Amino acid sequence: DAMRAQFMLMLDMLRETAQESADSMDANYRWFHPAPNTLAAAVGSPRMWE
Amino acid sequence: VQMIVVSSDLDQWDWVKWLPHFGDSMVYTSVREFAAEQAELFAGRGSFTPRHASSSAQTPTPHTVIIADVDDPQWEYVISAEGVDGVTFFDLTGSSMWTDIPERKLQFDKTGVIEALPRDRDTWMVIDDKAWFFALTDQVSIAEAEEFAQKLAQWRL
Amino acid sequence: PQAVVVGVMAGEGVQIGVLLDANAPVSVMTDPLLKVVNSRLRELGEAPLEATGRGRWALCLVDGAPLRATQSLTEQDVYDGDRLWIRFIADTERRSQVIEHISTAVASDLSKRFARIDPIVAVQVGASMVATGVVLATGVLGWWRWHHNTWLTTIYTAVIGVLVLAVAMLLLMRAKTDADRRVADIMLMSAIMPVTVAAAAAPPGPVGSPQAVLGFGVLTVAAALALRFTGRRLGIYTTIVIIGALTMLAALARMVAATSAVTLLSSLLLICVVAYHAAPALSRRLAGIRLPVFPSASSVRDVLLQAERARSFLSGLLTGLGVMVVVCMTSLCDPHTGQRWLPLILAGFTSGFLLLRGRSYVDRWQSITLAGTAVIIAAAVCVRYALELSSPLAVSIVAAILVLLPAAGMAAAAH
Amino acid sequence: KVVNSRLRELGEAPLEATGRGRWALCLVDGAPLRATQSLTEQDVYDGDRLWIRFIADTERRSQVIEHISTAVASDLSKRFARIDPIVAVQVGASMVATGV
Amino acid sequence: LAGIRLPVFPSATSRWVFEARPDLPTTVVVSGGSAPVLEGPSSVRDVLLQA
């Protein structure tokens, strides 16, 4: 049971490492491809025709 | 990017008037009409060729997008020649000549879920022959479209 | 009817009056409206409104609820003279999060939705526990005086008052925050009860009228003294002073000379009946007394402080009168003495007065306490006439009466 | 003239009004545009929206502004105000429940 | 009582498949904001109500 308990703990730390990497892709992709309804207010920003 | 529409239901495309991307130095009722004005310019050369990021620096700058809403059989000349490079067609009718290729077909379920073949994130190349879930559709009204276009219509080079 | 005038709120707090098209859909107007407010801010020399990342511009009621983009201004409950708010609402779209093992999943999700115990709350629990302990102590100490005339009750309770008050004073002086003040107030309020019964128990002999005069007097004084120096918990202290004051008047009369309790009970009821009309004036003049300041939220500060103080005094005053009327009214009616039906109908009309008067005040709690004061009297009278003069018809009738009474009102209002 | 003509083709009633006044262009807030200056002098560009309105002699406009924190005004609208029917229903339910 | 279900054991009759086809996402709806949205698999969403 001790090995089992330790094994479970090692798996948790990999979960955390994966999650931070995922947020970076969401932020980056969202930074280039916003939802269509928000595009009107952004017209004046330099992000247009970029 | 430059855009052209070939459609019979002109009342649906009325909002296009404000956009600059549809201008020229432009909506058509049929392929015969489009063939006389536009095809004389574009049919002159080439055929489609899948590109890549590094190749993007060499292809000509004005990419042309054409929307198909007429179902005219006269299109066979460009379809049997396998298109042209620098052009892209969207078929809104679902005609058999366009509909005979799974690698180019998007299917909608009653719930708005779209199905298509799976494609690789790094090369965009098709990796399997069986269709599967692809994406949930996002859509805007004509009013929203004209509202956005008017806002865009305010700017110039 | 083609247009309506409304006041629009913009960035950081500038209000601007505008005349809007009454029939175009709101989504067509939000864009040019933003342009106009920017023009006025620029001329004013203020910073214009700007977008931040991802979001959209919206037009909402002052409550924040956004208006339906496709509807006309006349289709909605918007009238000329109303006010609206232009606001920027950020995008909420984001990636989701999954966890594969159920044990870890349960722990992670559950710890965000709720708040766990901490040392701050821990003290309030202990303070409340000691308060309950001492009110039980005075309870047992008070009960002994009802069978024995020895000095024990006053002697023992006196030391308790000192000990509790002693701790309360230090806490009151060292206090810094609202949480600390809560602890201090709980402790101080708990000292009033032991000090009060410690005094009332001192006069020897069987308990009665002479002992009553001491108890309600010191009690009234203690509450008034605490209110004077603390300036917090106005409503509860106000309520204690009223019941202590009115009880002291009757006790002194009963102690010196009184032909009957009915005479005293009738007098108090009459005084209370007129006091309801005096209550708003009392609250209004009481608000002028100078005592320290602690807000529940530069010249504006004084107005709001005065407003909430006055409101606070009215609720407590109303509550004290309500307590007195039910005690007296239920004692005055009787199922065996003379014209048994006369006080019943008189109590009904007396209840109707408060039931109707509740409409004169806009405040939710004030109107509810008034309404509640009437309902309880009706139920109480039926119970009295159900316990005494007991029989199958009486209980059957009282049940029917009590169940129908509220049912008719609720049904007429909700359906 | 062309607007009234177009309205008739749509089957809509033409713009018409009664009383002393005049016809002019106005902004979304009702403010009229300058009669002697160019649209190029004014801040007008392609895709802007304008209104046609009758300026009666009786017209009066506030033209005044004031400052108060929006964050407080919005909170105070609910922090304390008059009673609501939904609450009365809930209290009513509680009262009848108390009765049984 | 809340139905928390512990994972079922394979009974030692098959090897592990390291990468089977991923599980299908689920959609949600709102009446006024009639535009639907998606947020995750059914097996995972239930736990948030179960706890």
CSV table of N, CA, C and O in Angstrom, one decimal, chain A residues 8 27 30 38-39 45:
chain,number,residue,atom,x,y,z
A,8,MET,N,0.7,7.0,-6.6
A,8,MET,CA,-0.3,7.9,-6.9
A,8,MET,C,0.2,9.4,-6.8
A,8,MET,O,-0.2,10.2,-7.6
A,27,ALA,N,-4.2,30.7,-24.2
A,27,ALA,CA,-3.9,32.2,-24.3
A,27,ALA,C,-3.4,32.5,-25.7
A,27,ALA,O,-3.9,33.5,-26.3
A,30,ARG,N,-6.2,32.0,-28.5
A,30,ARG,CA,-7.2,33.0,-28.2
A,30,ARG,C,-6.7,34.4,-28.7
A,30,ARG,O,-7.4,35.2,-29.2
A,38,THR,N,-17.0,39.3,-30.5
A,38,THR,CA,-16.1,40.4,-30.0
A,38,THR,C,-15.3,41.2,-31.0
A,38,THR,O,-14.7,42.2,-30.7
A,39,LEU,N,-15.3,40.7,-32.3
A,39,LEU,CA,-14.5,41.4,-33.4
A,39,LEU,C,-14.9,42.8,-33.6
A,39,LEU,O,-14.0,43.6,-34.0
A,45,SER,N,-8.5,48.6,-32.8
A,45,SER,CA,-7.2,48.1,-32.3
A,45,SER,C,-6.2,47.7,-33.4
A,45,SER,O,-6.7,47.4,-34.5
